[PDB]
Write an enzyme that holds these catalytic residues in place. Structure first.
Site, PDB file in Angstrom:
ATOM      1  N   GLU A  11      78.876  65.125  10.398  1.00 21.19           N
ATOM      2  CA  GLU A  11      78.653  66.226   9.291  1.00 21.19           C
ATOM      3  C   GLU A  11      79.351  65.703   7.768  1.00 21.19           C
ATOM      4  OE1 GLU A  11      76.937  68.547   9.534  1.00 21.19           O
ATOM      5  OE2 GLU A  11      76.705  69.085  11.546  1.00 21.19           O
ATOM      6  N   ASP A  20      72.878  71.392   2.341  1.00 17.26           N
ATOM      7  CA  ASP A  20      72.868  70.669   3.507  1.00 17.26           C
ATOM      8  C   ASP A  20      71.399  69.933   3.649  1.00 17.26           C
ATOM      9  OD1 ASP A  20      70.690  72.402   4.656  1.00 17.26           O
ATOM     10  OD2 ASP A  20      72.060  72.813   6.182  1.00 17.26           O
ATOM     11  N   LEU A  32      77.836  76.363   7.554  1.00 22.29           N
ATOM     12  CA  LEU A  32      76.621  76.754   6.800  1.00 22.29           C
ATOM     13  C   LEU A  32      77.041  78.110   6.069  1.00 22.29           C
ATOM     14  CD1 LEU A  32      73.499  77.228   5.899  1.00 22.29           C
ATOM     15  CD2 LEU A  32      73.469  78.581   7.954  1.00 22.29           C
ATOM     16  N   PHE A 104      76.167  73.025  17.690  1.00 24.92           N
ATOM     17  CA  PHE A 104      76.766  73.064  16.309  1.00 24.92           C
ATOM     18  C   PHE A 104      75.708  73.151  15.041  1.00 24.92           C
ATOM     19  CE2 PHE A 104      80.795  72.750  13.666  1.00 24.92           C
ATOM     20  CZ  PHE A 104      80.280  72.213  12.784  1.00 24.92           C
ATOM     21  N   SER A 117      63.654  69.509  28.012  1.00 25.77           N
ATOM     22  CA  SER A 117      64.888  68.633  28.073  1.00 25.77           C
ATOM     23  C   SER A 117      66.008  69.097  28.859  1.00 25.77           C
ATOM     24  CB  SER A 117      65.184  68.417  26.538  1.00 25.77           C
ATOM     25  OG  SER A 117      64.142  67.985  25.741  1.00 25.77           O
ATOM     26  N   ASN A 132      62.006  62.818  25.789  1.00 22.84           N
ATOM     27  CA  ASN A 132      61.526  64.133  25.320  1.00 22.84           C
ATOM     28  C   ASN A 132      62.400  64.883  24.140  1.00 22.84           C
ATOM     29  OD1 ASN A 132      61.877  67.280  25.928  1.00 22.84           O
ATOM     30  ND2 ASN A 132      59.870  66.655  26.539  1.00 22.84           N
TER      31      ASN A 132
END
Ligand SMILES: [Cl-]
Ligand SMILES: [Cl-]
Length: 162
Positions: A11, A20, A32, A104, A117, A132
């Site tokens: 991040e 972002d 965010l 996250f 998945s 996948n």
């Protein structure tokens, strides 16, 4: 390596409001603020999150504080989620961190959406799950990050972060 250090690599850290990868207003370590286009609306959410008039800037400790809250929320959210929890319980420590990273980034709902998945992961079919996971908007939009998380699920080690 651990979840915090992993996420801090993915991040980065910015002490001033920024947009972002999707053009949303964010601050700190991937926190965010809002999906709204208004910079005021972001400043307002920011001051409310920090509890002080920030003027769009926070200190390092304040960023770290939002980060701790956010990693906690992600864990608790996975554990409350009917679809995520069983996957999380079946995984080893390393791979649990990969699942946390995805939540996250994309939120619990978004992740819960990767039905196929998720089952593969739960079945321990690493290579298949990796293939996948790659067929996703996620991978096409943030490929380098996606690659690191995918590789982590594939190997069960932290090498992609080394
Ligand atoms: Cl908050
Ligand atoms: Cl990326």
């Amino acid at each position: 390596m651990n979840i915090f250090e992993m996420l801090r690599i993915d991040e980065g850290l910015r002490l001033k409001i920024y947009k972002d990868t999707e053009g949303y207003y964010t601050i700190g370590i991937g926190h965010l603020l809002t999906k709204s286009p208004s910079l005021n609306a972001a400043k307002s959410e920011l001051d409310k999150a920090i509890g002080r008039n920030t003027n769009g800037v926070i200190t390092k400790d304040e960023a770290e504080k939002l980060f701790n809250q956010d990693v906690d929320a992600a864990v608790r959210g996975i554990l409350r989620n009917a679809k995520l929890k069983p996957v999380y319980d079946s995984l080893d420590a390393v791979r649990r961190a990969a699942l946390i990273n995805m939540v996250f980034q994309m939120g619990e709902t978004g992740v819960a959406g990767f039905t196929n998945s998720l089952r593969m992961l739960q079945q321990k079919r690493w290579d298949e799950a990796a293939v996948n996971l790659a067929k996703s908007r996620w991978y096409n939009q943030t490929p380098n990050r996606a690659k690191r998380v995918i590789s982590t699920f594939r190997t069960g080690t932290w090498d992609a972060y080394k």
